[PDB]
Swiss-Prot record, chains A, B:
Amino acids binding heme b: 49, 78
Protein name as it appears in the record: Hemoglobin subunit beta
Single GO term (MF): oxygen binding
Oligomeric form and interacting partners: Heterotetramer of two alpha chains and two beta chains.
SUPFAM superfamilies named among the record's database cross-references: Globin-like (SSF46458)
Pfam families in UniProt: Globin
GO CC term (a single one): blood microparticle
GO biological process, one term: hydrogen peroxide catabolic process
Family statement: Belongs to the globin family.
Assigned keywords, A-Z: Heme, Iron, Metal-binding, Oxygen transport, Transport
Domain Globin: 2-129
Curated annotation (Swiss-Prot), chains C, D:
Gene Ontology biological-process entries: hydrogen peroxide catabolic process
Domain of life: Eukaryota
InterPro entries for the chain: Globin, Globin-like_sf, Globin/Proto, Hemoglobin_a-typ, Hemoglobin_oxygen_transport
Protein's recorded name: Hemoglobin subunit alpha
Keyword Transcription in annotation: no
List of residues binding heme b: 87
Protein species of origin: Mustelus griseus (Spotless smooth-hound)
Pfam family, one: Globin
PROSITE patterns found in the cross-reference section: GLOBIN
Gene: HBA
Amino acid sequence: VHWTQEERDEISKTFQGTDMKTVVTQALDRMFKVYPWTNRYFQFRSSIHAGIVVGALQDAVKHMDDVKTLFKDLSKKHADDLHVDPGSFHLLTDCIIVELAYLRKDCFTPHIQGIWDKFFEVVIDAISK
Amino acid sequence: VHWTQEERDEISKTFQGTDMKTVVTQALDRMFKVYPWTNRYFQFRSSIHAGIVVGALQDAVKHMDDVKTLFKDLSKKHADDLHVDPGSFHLLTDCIIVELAYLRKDCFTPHIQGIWDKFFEVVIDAISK
Amino acid sequence: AFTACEKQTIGKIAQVLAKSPEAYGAECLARLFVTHPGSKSYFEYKDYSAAGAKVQVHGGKVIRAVVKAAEHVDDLHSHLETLALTHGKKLLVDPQNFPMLSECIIVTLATHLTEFSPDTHCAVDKLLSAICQELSSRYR
Amino acid sequence: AFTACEKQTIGKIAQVLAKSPEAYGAECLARLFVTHPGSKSYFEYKDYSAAGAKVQVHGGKVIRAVVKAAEHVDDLHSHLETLALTHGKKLLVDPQNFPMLSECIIVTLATHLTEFSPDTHCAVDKLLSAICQELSSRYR
Ligand code: HEM
Ligand code: HEM
Ligand code: HEM
Ligand code: HEM
């Protein structure tokens, strides 16, 4: 998708310098309350599940230029197993972005938001069908 | 994407013995009527436009296996030049399905619909950046 | 919201639907099940085909509500209150499944109705989209 | 529609948003234009950032509209009629765009409020949701 140098830096530097485990944890919590129907899919602890997810997103920055393949099976699970609706994936990442915005406040400019938006857009594409 | 000889035949036959030009023309006028906002994108005759669209779809039929690469230029066009929200593409295809469902009447079983839904779900992917 | 002309052609469709709610409803669900497998996850049925006994029974319940809904276009919010609390707070249905059923109901009509012009399509769509907006508005 | 609890948080937020509508509005739109470029075609702007002169004036109109809407939670249908017709019939704004702007308004809030818990986010999302549903109700 073409990753501007600055873009790569921003993602990887965040997964290294920031506590993504608790960011994602809080994001799962937010999601479950804001978009109630998401609970249905999880019928387990958010704190524990967070590590798994951040773990997957981490391998994603490692293989940024090739997420679709690294997420091959990952999507299969979400589809023909848990049956998660493809149009619901953005609900989590959207919540991860809010948590990120609340932590960085002013530093989370429209421009930086766009970097993260771009990143989750490709993560959403990779993990959905 | 995998293609059955049955799904290949159903789609192949339709573009060969049915006046798709008419189907798409009525599909467009239908879209303009049911989803009013799609008109803003075209501000021209659907009668003549249908032909170009059918021209592209007939192309995707002749190369069903990789429409993604076959539509790389169409995507950019709709994406960067037309500014068509990637979420509105199905509005046109849904209408073409309704037009077909209207044509074939009861010969349009859930099974047959599933085939076309697949074809178009693929054509939408190859057109949404 | 709805114009006399729309209520009228909508009223002409509920009539057709009311004749055999089971047949129409079973076709809708079946189309939905075949095109969006993920929806099956909400119903524990042995048969997901139109021949299924639970599909037919449920299918008639669906169409019967859509028909009852047509008679209350002026007060859909209060009319669908319980049905919404059921699909929302109770069953936790992903709102993404609604438009999918709608199109299936729309496609089914395009198959039996003698005439399904852009005008009629538009009126039914408005009814369905209005019903769905209610069913996905009570998750708490 | 809203519980006295939500009308509470919604009130505080409105009080805040009201202090600098242009400032907030400009950020919301700037965020929209970066994450959803297609939405730039509805505006005749030179600069699409929060510093853009036109972006700021309009941003203030949007936020004031949202703030005013908060004071009419009880009856938004009638309150937003004109606005709904403007976006629906006049401008022909693709509905897809509404949820994007709402999400951008939410991120802007999370960026500026000392407290933005899921509960607070819920009420805001509820308001934003109602507002957008009325704004996409007058196409047809
Ligand atoms: C795009 C962001 C997402 C990522 C990166 C992600 C990643 C993961 C990973 C790596 C797993 C475990 C893999 C395995 O067990 O082999 C998982 C499990 C799960 N995910 Fe996601 N997921 C995402 C979105 C979603 C969404 C939106 C839902 C639905 C609301 C969802 C529902 C589930 C469920 C139910 C499980 C739990 C499985 C269990 O505990 O048995 N995921 N996810
Ligand atoms: C996924 C199905 C679609 C296909 C196969 C398709 C195909 C085409 C083709 C082949 C062209 C010719 C233009 C060129 O070659 O330069 C075209 C133009 C255009 N399409 Fe589509 N299109 C699709 C969906 C849509 C939708 C849903 C909209 C809007 C809601 C749309 C809006 C436009 C517009 C505005 C033009 C410009 C007409 C011109 O060339 O002056 N298209 N489309
Ligand atoms: C067009 C909108 C829809 C209408 C008019 C509708 C109507 C109905 C009605 C009248 C009932 C029975 C109420 C009762 O017995 O208490 C029902 C139940 C139910 N609906 Fe829907 N529904 C709609 C969409 C959906 C969707 C999209 C799903 C999910 C794919 C869904 C899942 C269910 C389930 C699982 C039940 C529980 C019944 C049971 O098996 O016990 N419905 N629906
Ligand atoms: C979600 C809440 C929204 C609110 C509260 C809102 C509010 C407003 C208000 C108050 C106006 C000025 C009305 C007037 O006095 O003429 C306006 C105009 C307009 N809005 Fe929105 N709007 C919303 C969403 C959108 C969206 C999603 C788009 C498109 C991306 C959009 C596109 C426009 C355009 C192009 C105008 C005309 C601006 C001009 O005069 O040049 N609006 N909106």
